[PDB]
From a paper:
We here present crystal structures of herring [name], the first structures of this protein from any species. [name] shows a bi-lobed structure with four domains arranged around a common active site, forming a deep cleft between domains I–II (residues 1–195 and 196–308) and domains III–IV (residues 309–425 and 426–567). As expected, all four domains contribute to the active site with one loop per domain; loop 1 (residues 119–126), loop 2 (residues 292–297), loop 3 (residues 379–384), and loop 4 (residues 507–520). Herring [name] binds substrate similarly to PGM1, but lacks enzymatic activity.
Furthermore, we have solved the structure of the most common [name] variants found in the Baltic and Atlantic herring (bPGM5 and aPGM5), differing by only one amino acid substitution (Ala330Val), and explore the possible functional significance of the mutation. The aPGM5 structure consists of residues 4–567, except for residues 511–513. Despite crystallization of aPGM5 in a condition without divalent ions, a metal ion is observed in the active site, coordinated at around 2.4 Å distance by Asp292, Asp294, and Asp296 in loop 2. Due to the long coordination distances, the ion was modelled as calcium rather than magnesium. The structures of apo aPGM5 and bPGM5 are very similar (root mean square deviation (RMSD) of 0.64 Å over 545 Cα atoms), but aPGM5 is further closed, showing a shift of up to 2.4 Å of domain IV towards domain I. In contrast, aPGM5 did not crystallize in the same conditions but at other conditions formed small and irreproducible needle crystals in space group P21. Interestingly, Val330 is involved in a crystal contact in bPGM5, but the corresponding interface is not formed in the structure of aPGM5. The structures of aPGM5 and bPGM5 are overall very similar and even the backbone conformations at the mutation site are essentially identical.
Numbering used by the authors: 4 to 510, 514 to 567
Write the structure that this text describes.
Amino acid sequence: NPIPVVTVQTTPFDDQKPGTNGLRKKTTVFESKKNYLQNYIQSVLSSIDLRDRQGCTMVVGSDGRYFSRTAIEVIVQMAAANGIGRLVIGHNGILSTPAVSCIIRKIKAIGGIILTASRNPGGPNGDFGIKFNVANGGPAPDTVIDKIHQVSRTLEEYAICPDMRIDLSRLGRQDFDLENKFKPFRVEIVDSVEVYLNLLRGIFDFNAIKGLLTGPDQLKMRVDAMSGVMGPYVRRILCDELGAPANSAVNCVPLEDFGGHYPDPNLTYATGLVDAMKGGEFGFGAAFDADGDRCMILGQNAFFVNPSDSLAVVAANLSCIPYFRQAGVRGFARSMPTSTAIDRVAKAMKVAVYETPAGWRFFGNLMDSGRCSFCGEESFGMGSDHIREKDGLWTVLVWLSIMAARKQGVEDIVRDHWTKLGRNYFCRFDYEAIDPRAAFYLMKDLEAVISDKAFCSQKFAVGNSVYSVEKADNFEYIDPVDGTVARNQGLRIIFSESSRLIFRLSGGVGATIRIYAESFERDPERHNREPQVVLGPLIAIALKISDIHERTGRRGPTVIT
Ligand SMILES: [Ca+2]
Ligand code: NA
């Protein structure tokens, strides 16, 4: 009754370079470009050491987008033919990125494959992605990234078990006897929320949260899963377990196309939530991305909690959470483009702060060496060492726990925080799908100016606002664990007037330039100012000095947050 192992001849693709958040292509590429999915999967598998690959376990999940159930079928076939012993898969293929990280860590899997494009639309016309996480549970480190690219560039063949078929609909085991293999290749379809839920039980006070979402004084919340993966997570956790009304759950039926909407939590694409939070009926609002790792939070009347502020506010109030009461707090970390608001909190409560490059994987070594307990990014990301990924619902539960302890509302906390520590006005401009070449020459020409020998003695004037350059360079990071240096991680112009400008280049299939602007103000009276007025100038400096409009032929940013 054996299942044969078939080796297929193939020719390599040149574009299979995995980005900071996996390999993202239009669904057509994976679905029609022959041997494209197989080539990449085999590459991911070959990056695993040959010795360690035998009999090991991997976790597989998706956000439910179109082509996921087909990608998983190929994943189990190629996994079996490559010696993997067991695959843990989510019911119906549904497993959020935080849950995948939690499973990898619990059962001590060698890694996990996540089918998702995070903030990108899904469906036959939409996009598709493949993320690969390693043993510690976080995203693949740079070493693995290069290894995958190297293999993908030289792949001549791949192994697969085409005669293998799997049913995700019913939970349990599905043993397969492979040829020339004693132990049966196992496949475990597990509950999508159970293991992840039990992790949260040990972190938070579910009684405290349950009481806030219950009673005459109950909090009225609207949680928008955007028809992604987090639908069943909020329904089973927030509603069923924590007692929130059913109407609190919105767009919680995972759809292949996300109902035809973008799952990008922010003031631009989560308009469905902002409209309701503008009505004024709800005291708390939250939206998740497709895979459930990013999260936007809104107060009453659509009070926008800036993710950099969200990270600092939470840091300042971690005592409300049992997890950090017991284990304490060993350090904070933030990506470099994230505002220095957390730095304020840390210098106050005497805790270390690490300024890492953009990308959650750079948080792995800090947590694995006990140097960091809590971290986040301006990119709507936050998390702790309960796993090694950013966790959306963890952020909501964190905020609900701080609200039940403070006995206040969202805006009350944030403004109180501003009074005690000052406000870090912050915003980000995104220029998506711009010509990759122009984006490149824009960034090195700009670096050439930033790097000039006399640039630090330059002053920029917008009306009566003057910004004097203090230090500017191309960001560089030295890993404190292995001592490896990460370069070209974002240009920086630090002015000696409590302000920063950051320029970051990341990956039609074109480039994306993001411009971050930060300005700090001490006086609480000037904390009511409009961010557009505080940050308006800084951007004007950034636009003239970068000349991004003329260089890219764009008239405005694709997105503002
Ligand atoms: Ca994501
Ligand atoms: Na992502």
